[PDB]
């Protein structure tokens, strides 16, 4: 019954053509051409991002939605876009990335952008069964889309359930993907987490319209229900006018080399 649940229903009614167009309507996208060429060539010293994720985290970081400091842990690191971005920040002292990296799941990519030497990647790891570790900055970018809102809700609550174990260890900063913030059980869990750990959910402009994902971050505090519905309204306006118009932006280029001394 929430606006988001209606959005899901309408989204499933779209055909292949409509979906493609709607998905990119009025969104921002980084140009990945150069990065893809460099990675295909096996270049590791050009500072290009291993995934579109680097730009996503940069957006939150550059405007204070999440501070990247001290010991960073990245749950569901995949290729490592967030790990490399974090590793390049002077305030960060170490980065530990964990991901499944198997049976189709993306494995950590090895490049040598600034601070690559302070990153420890660990694949073949299900973060839902990983014993929480003390850290200062907790990142998690997990959440698989589903045509079923019930399923997206289940997946989102599971992620929040696991993340709560890590936040309970005491963390200063966090940025966690919330796949389906529009589901009522999720809204309630977010309200409870907000009272316990602070923060709020923010929509990243680089997210495609095909997902209602928002990120639970430590750098701001606001009315969760209100802001989730603001995004539901935006997503629905875009479905009524699916122009497929995209705004291209320059991708992230990080410094290179090891952080030493």
The catalytic residue positions are: 56, 141, 177, 213
Of 5 and 106, which has the nearer Cβ to ligand SAH? 106
99 near ligand SAH, judged by CB under 6 A: yes
Minimum CB–partner distance for residue 146 and ligand SAH (Å): 13
Nearer to ligand SAH, 23 or 155 (CB): 155
Residue closer to ligand SAH, measured from CB, 14 or 130: 130
Q: How far is the CB of 47 from ligand SAH (least distance, A)?
A: 15
- 116 among annotated binding-site residues: no
Give the residue, chosen from 66, 111, 127, 187, that forms a contact with ligand SAH under the rule CB under 6 A.
Answer: 127
Is residue 105 a contact residue for ligand SAH (CB under 6 A)? yes
Query: Closest distance between ligand SAH and the C-beta of residue 107, in Å?
Result: 8
236-240: which pairs have CB atoms within 8 A and are 24 or more residues apart?
236/3, 236/6, 236/7, 236/10, 238/22, 238/25, 238/26, 238/209, 239/7, 239/10, 239/11, 239/14, 239/22, 239/25, 239/209
Indicate whether 128 belongs to the interface with ligand SAH (CB under 6 A).
yes
Task: By CB under 6 A, name the one of 24, 79, 155, 203 that touches ligand SAH.
Answer: 79
Distance of CA 20 to the CA centre of its chain: 21
Asked if 134 touches ligand SAH (CB under 6 A), the answer is no
Task: Go through 11-25 and write b for each residue having 16 or more CB atoms within 10 A of its CB, e for each that does not.
Answer: beebeeeeeebbbbb
Output the CA angle 186-169-125, nearest 5 degrees: 75
| 147 appears as a binding residue in the annotation | no
Question: Which residues of the shown chain bind ligand SAH in the complex (CB under 6 A)?
Answer: 51, 53-54, 76-82, 98-100, 105-106, 125-128, 141-142
């Amino acid at each position: 019954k929430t606006l988001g649940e209606v959005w899901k229903r309408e989204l499933n009614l779209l055909d292949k053509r409509q979906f493609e167009l709607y998905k990119r309507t009025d969104i921002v996208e980084v140009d990945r051409d150069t990065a893809r060429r460099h990675l295909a060539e096996g270049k590791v010293d050009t500072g290009v991002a291993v995934s579109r994720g680097t730009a996503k985290l940069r957006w939150f970081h550059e405007r204070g939605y999440v501070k990247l400091e001290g010991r960073v842990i990245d749950l569901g690191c995949g290729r490592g876009g967030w790990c490399y971005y974090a590793a390049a920040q002077k305030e960060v002292s170490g980065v530990k990335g964990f991901t499944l990296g198997r049976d189709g799941h993306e494995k950590p990519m090895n490049v040598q952008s600034l601070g690559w030497n302070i990153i420890t990647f660990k694949d073949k790891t299900d973060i839902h069964r990983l014993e929480p570790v003390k850290c200062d900055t907790l990142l998690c970018d997990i959440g698989e889309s589903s045509s079923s809102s019930v399923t997206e809700g289940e997946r989102t609550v599971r992620v929040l359930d696991t993340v709560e174990k890590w936040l309970a260890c005491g963390v200063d900063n966090f940025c966690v993907k919330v796949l389906a913030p529009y589901m009522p059980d999720v809204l309630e869990k977010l309200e409870l987490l907000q009272r316990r750990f602070g923060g709020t959910v923010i929509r990243n402009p680089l997210s495609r319209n095909s997902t209602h994902e928002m990120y639970y971050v430590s750098g701001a505090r606001s009315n969760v229900t209100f802001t989730v519905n603001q995004t539901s309204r935006l997503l629905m306006r875009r479905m009524r006018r699916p122009t497929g118009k995209v705004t291209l932006e320059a991708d992230v280029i990080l410094p290179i080399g090891t952080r030493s001394v």
